[PDB]
Amino acid sequence: MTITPQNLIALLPLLIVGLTVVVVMLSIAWRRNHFLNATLSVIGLNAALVSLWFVGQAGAMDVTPLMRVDGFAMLYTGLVLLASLATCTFAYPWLEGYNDNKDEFYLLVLIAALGGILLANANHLASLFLGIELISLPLFGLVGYAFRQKRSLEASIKYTILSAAASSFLLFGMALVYAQSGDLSFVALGKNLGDGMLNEPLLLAGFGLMIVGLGFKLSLVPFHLWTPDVYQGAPAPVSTFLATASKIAIFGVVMRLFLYAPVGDSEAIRVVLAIIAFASIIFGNLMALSQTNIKRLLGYSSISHLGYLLVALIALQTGEMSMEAVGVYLAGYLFSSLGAFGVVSLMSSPYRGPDADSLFSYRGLFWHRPILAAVMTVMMLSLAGIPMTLGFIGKFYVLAVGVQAHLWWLVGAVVVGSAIGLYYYLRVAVSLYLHAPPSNWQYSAGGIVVLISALLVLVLGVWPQPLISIVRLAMPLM
């Protein structure tokens, strides 16, 4: 299919982010300026975020044999852009203490945001593969941005090797699926099967290998062991981006793939995903019980929350509010993770060299940083799914979707994992208020971002109807 001017209007955030990549690159080539290049990056990301309005009035269309733009893609594009803007905002005060070049951080963040937008719009195996690697490789750079630091180099090497392995698994699965089906579009994966013969062995093997790759990308058990190490070793704004934008974009494209593929209605794939979701919820909650490190704890938390999201994903073919539950949960999880990782990033900024440890020591945070302690305890209550927080609204959506589809094992898993999460989240929240033995406007901007995230979490926790209406307004193509 060719490209029309209307298709160009539907292409607007991708084009704006790519143009921002080129413009920031040429500005770095002109003269290295941290403030100017960070400003150009955030201006381009804000321009894409406001061009989503013109995308919405362009209507839902098919822009390529590869991309499909609708309300689904609009919602995930907005979430990815918000995560990228917050990552840049947290990254500036951290990079103020970085001795080497700081401008390449924003270039990598922009390219990863471009990959997230492509995954939001992806309707094809080619675009899904390309969006995954367009997210992953800038994250290879960003996770090991402070490569002089030993932990950052360790996390970079681990993430690079394991993500290359998962990419090989994903591509081999895509090749097996293509060998079975003959077309790489999402809607044709299983369309050449009839009379109850949907469970073709080659198609199922290909989808299993893609499940291996995507479950690496989503920190799902048993492809989850990288998550605490890479979350701990990466710079804290990189940890923010890796927790929010990468996970959200990959889960959105997995949502679209299992919605559109006729093989997404297979029983065996559903049982395998149920096993993965059960194990992910239980294992991620259990493994965070005894963590004194906030980054590893948040990595295990990511494993559990992606398990809850996968539980919502399993009921996609049966229920009708599964993707609405996914949207509400992903908005709440994005804002909670933005607040938590942003408080960690603000307390870790500026970067105090590679030879000095970046340990958090959250105990007694209220007595010198009271607003940050309030934001972090709001995020700990939100990630626990406690009422008056948006995380509870997401957990409620997941539970309603599970009860509707009679997924009782997953329902019990959610309840048990919620109790275990309650334990360790409340431990962190009460450690903030115990007793233990900046000065520029960009640090204040990061504090404003985490404060606004806390206010949004509380307000949409007590009044979730605007978010629900927005998510229901983002209807993909049936």
């Binding site: 390219i111 471009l114 990959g115 750079g141 097996l176 073709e200 062995p201």
Partner: protein
């Protein structure tokens, strides 16, 4: 056409098996280059002429050159690699080889239960590939340029000397 396919596939399998069990890095890279040439012959036997040409031009002509270059820069004399031979110990490789064999049997069992009319080997030229590349796959090309740009920026940021 089939005879070249089977010989090139056998050569690729044997060369890769030599790669993963070798101690000398330059010899392992040479066997890898041989396996890539064999896989290019497999591509040419299947009619994917542009794929075979790029297999020699880029995979065996750029990426392996980068690997060889890095091996010269390290001056790898097998320090604590050849002197240990940990992968040659049966207690080390008997587990992963059994795991890989089990995965291979599962994948082959899935493969053998698929419809197969045969591969005709009709040559698909680079002209048709370029027509598809700048037609239905335009965003793949532009975002692949962005992907290579990201790889360039990351590798420059990490691989400096100062």
């Amino acid at each position: 056409m089939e005879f070249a396919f089977y010989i090139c596939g056998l050569i690729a399998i044997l060369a890769t098996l030599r790669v993963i069990t070798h101690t000398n890095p330059v010899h392992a890279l040479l066997y890898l280059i041989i396996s890539l040439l064999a896989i290019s012959g497999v591509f040419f036997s299947l009619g994917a002429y542009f794929a075979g040409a790029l297999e020699i031009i880029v995979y065996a002509g750029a990426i392996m050159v980068l690997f060889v270059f890095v091996v010269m820069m390290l001056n790898l004399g097998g320090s604590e690699i050849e002197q240990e031979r940990q992968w040659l110990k049966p207690q080390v490789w008997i587990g992963p080889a059994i795991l890989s064999a089990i995965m291979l049997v599962v994948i082959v069992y899935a493969i053998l239960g698929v419809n197969d009319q045969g591969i005709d080997g009709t040559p698909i030229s680079a002209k048709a590939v370029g027509i598809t590349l700048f037609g239905p796959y335009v965003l793949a090309v532009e975002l692949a340029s962005m992907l290579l740009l990201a790889g360039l920026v990351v590798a420059f940021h990490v691989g400096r000397e100062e």
